Design a protein around this ligand. Structure first.
Ligand code: HEM
Ligand SMILES: CCc1ccc(C(=O)O)cc1
Ligand SMILES: [Cl-]
Length: 393
């Protein structure tokens, strides 16, 4: 039997402090019904992991937001990777895996690390900075658009466009409808940059187009795959890095452990992804009647997965509410799991690692120094402003 809850997981009060409500969602049962939006929800680790790894029943081709593409028109042409199922998903996924491959990371690591080192030294000269605007946003903006091969003109549209994308996965609340209304200039900029002439040879975007020669994607598929990287490739990392700084500012003991062994930087970042889960939620749509955790669900139903809750589920994690940079993080679902698991995870971890490495080697303390402000988004968890004082090592 399935409990009905009135919790709105897309309300500002929920975003402001989701953790009590997430425990209510977990402890009510393995599967809940959210009467506010007429969707099923799973918030425990086991069921979230199971849904993610059962793509033939919990599909993505009817949308991974609230909207069902079989019932409503998508606000933009469907993503060829995020909003596709196998087999259509497979070859586009392979292209992005190769574009963002381990081999590709060799070509960008030195510049990504150099930019992170320089940014931290720059911020140490200022002393008191906003870790969002001046760090979590500034650093990805300084490396990722260039790595994409984007021209300089128009980059002001990148973060607004991503904010729209992530709000649009949500329900038709004020956040979503404000985001979609008059979004055309953002869409126009992105869609134009996805065309082959506008992408610098050697960058991620041009490499996507180069794979049209192989038969893995057609030329008309390449712009939409560039669009995927321009949708996901900046804003999630902004909130991942901001999350990591927020954790280190709140857990000084863990900053000191990181200073003691900067080779913990990569796992310190992975733990931040688990702890904050910058990508909080995604939907699936059932392709058939299915039973889940003892409960039954009909065909064509939306299922909301609480990734952040799964990453704090005490059934799976010891001390889930503690930030522990030596935690064995493998198994967390902050990057997803299964056939859709973050194809950009090597870029994300690269940025996160080298920024936390720079902090580890250069900073002695991070003290919150002014009002903290949360940024509200139907899908992304993160801060709008994080004023901190950095003390040099
Ligand atoms: C901390 C940073 C990031 C987080 C937390 C994150 C989170 C996620 C999650 C949870 C999914 C699963 C989607 C699903 O199961 O429906 C995903 C997929 C995806 N991500 Fe990431 N992401 C991050 C960074 C990036 C970056 C840097 C890129 C590109 C450069 C990227 C591109 C993608 C793409 C294209 C997909 C779709 C993969 C597929 O459907 O096969 N993401 N991401
Ligand atoms: C990081 C979540 C995300 C993944 C993929 C897309 C896309 O394909 O547009 C958009 C967002
Ligand atoms: Cl678009």
């Amino acid at each position: 039997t399935i409990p009905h809850l009135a919790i709105d997981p897309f309300s500002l009060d929920f975003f402001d402090d989701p953790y009590p409500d997430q425990q209510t969602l977990r402890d009510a049962g393995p599967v809940v019904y959210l009467d506010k939006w007429n969707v099923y929800g799973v918030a425990r680790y086991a069921e979230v992991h199971a849904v993610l790894n059962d793509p033939t029943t919990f599909c993505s081709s009817r949308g991974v937001g609230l909207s069902d593409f079989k019932k409503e028109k998508p606000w933009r042409p469907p993503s060829l990777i995020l909003e596709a199922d196998p087999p259509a998903h497979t070859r586009p996924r392979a292209v992005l895996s190769k574009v963002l491959s381990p081999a590709t990371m060799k070509t960008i690591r030195d510049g990504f690390a150099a930019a992170a080192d320089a940014k931290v030294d720059e911020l140490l000269q200022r002393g008191c900075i906003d870790a969002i605007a001046d760090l979590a946003e500034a650093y990805p903006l300084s490396v990722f658009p260039d790595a994409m091969g984007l021209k300089q003109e128009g980059r002001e549209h990148l973060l607004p466009y991503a904010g729209l994308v992530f709000n649009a996965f949500g329900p038709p609340n004020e956040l979503r409808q404000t985001a979609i209304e008059r979004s055309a200039p953002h869409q126009a900029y992105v869609n134009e940059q996805c065309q082959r002439p506008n992408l610098a040879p050697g960058g991620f975007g041009a490499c996507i187009h180069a794979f049209t020669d192989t038969g893995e994607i057609t030329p008309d598929e390449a712009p939409l795959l560039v669009r995927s990287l321009l949708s996901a490739g900046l804003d999630a990392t902004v909130n991942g890095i901001g999350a990591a700084v927020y954790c280190l500012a709140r857990f000084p003991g863990e900053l000191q452990r990181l200073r003691s062994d900067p080779t913990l930087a990569r796992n310190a970042f992975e733990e931040a992804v688990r702890f904050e889960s910058p990508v909080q939620t995604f939907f699936r749509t059932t392709t058939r009647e299915v039973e889940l955790g003892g409960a039954v669900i009909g065909e064509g139903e939306k299922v909301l997965m609480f990734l952040g809750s799964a990453n704090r589920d005490p059934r799976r994690w010891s001390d889930p509410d503690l930030y522990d940079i030596t935690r064995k993080t493998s198994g967390h679902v902050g990057f997803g799991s299964g056939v859709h698991m973050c194809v950009g995870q090597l870029v994300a971890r690269l940025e996160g690692e080298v920024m936390l490495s720079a902090l580890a080697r250069k900073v002695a303390a991070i003290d919150i120094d002014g009002p903290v402000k949360r940024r509200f988004n139907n899908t992304l968890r993160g801060l709008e402003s994080l004023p901190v004082k950095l003390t040099p090592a």
